[PDB]
């Protein structure tokens, strides 16, 4: 089914990569390696969990593992682009402990699939 188009390795404009397995059941499971300069929790793999349906994808990475804890998480909501160079256009929300309660940052990531 469609899951074939998603499963593999992707990268964004910041050099972050993720490896995902997309299940025919809609499940998204993988590992994310963050390389956005200046941000915490770079390099080491963090678990990705998400879902997809039609052209729409969403996934979550909680930025705590055995090597670094950034007291934050990011949720991406995206849409798939088809062939030649497959693409996922996303908007993300990063929720973190701000000092007087949770805070959120927003941004956009474009992922391109590794050939
Ligand atoms: O600094 C943190 O709290 C954890 C690292 C967050 C990295 C962000 S998530 C959205 C954006 N896209 C990336 O690949 N890295 C940054
Ligand atoms: Zn299938
Ligand atoms: Zn499954
Ligand atoms: Zn915390």
Return the domain boundaries, the chain.
1-115
Handedness of CA 89, 67, 28, 2 (dihedral sign): positive
Cα three-residue angle 24-28-32, rounded to 5 degrees: 150
CA of residue 24 to ligand 3 center, whole Å: 7
Q: Provide the 8-state DSSP code for 5.
A: G
Quick check: 94 and 72 in contact, CB under 8 A?
Answer: yes
Q: Kindly tell me the burial class for residue 19, based on how many C-beta atoms sit within 10 Å of its own C-beta (0-12, 13-18, 19 or more).
A: middle
Q: Which residue, among 61, 73, 59, 1, has the nearest Cα to 28 in the 3D structure? A: 59
Resolution in A: 1.9
| Nearest ligand 1 atom, CA 15 | 14
Technique behind the model: X-ray
Q: Whose CA is nearest to atom 6 of ligand 1?
A: 39
Q: For residues 62 and 47, is the Cβ–Cβ distance under 8 A?
A: yes
The two structure tokens encoding residue 27: 């499940």
Which of 3.40.50.10800, 2.30.110.10, 2.40.128.30, 2.10.260.10 would CATH assign to domain 1-115?
A: 2.40.128.30
Burial group, residue 74, by CB count within 10 angstroms (0-12, 13-18, 19+): buried
Say which residue the tokens 């490896």 belong to.
19
């Amino acid at each position: 089914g469609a899951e074939a188009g998603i499963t593999g390795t992707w990268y964004n404009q910041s050099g972050s990569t993720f490896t995902v397995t997309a299940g025919a059941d809609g499940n998204l499971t993988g590992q994310y390696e963050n390389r956005a300069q200046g941000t915490g929790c770079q390099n080491s793999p963090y678990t990705l969990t998400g879902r997809y349906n039609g052209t729409k994808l969403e996934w979550r990475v909680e930025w705590n593992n055995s090597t670094e804890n950034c007291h934050s998480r990011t949720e991406w909501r995206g849409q798939y682009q088809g062939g030649a160079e497959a693409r996922i256009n996303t908007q993300w929300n990063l929720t973190y402990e701000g000092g007087s309660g949770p805070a959120t940052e927003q941004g956009q990531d474009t992922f391109t699939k590794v050939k």
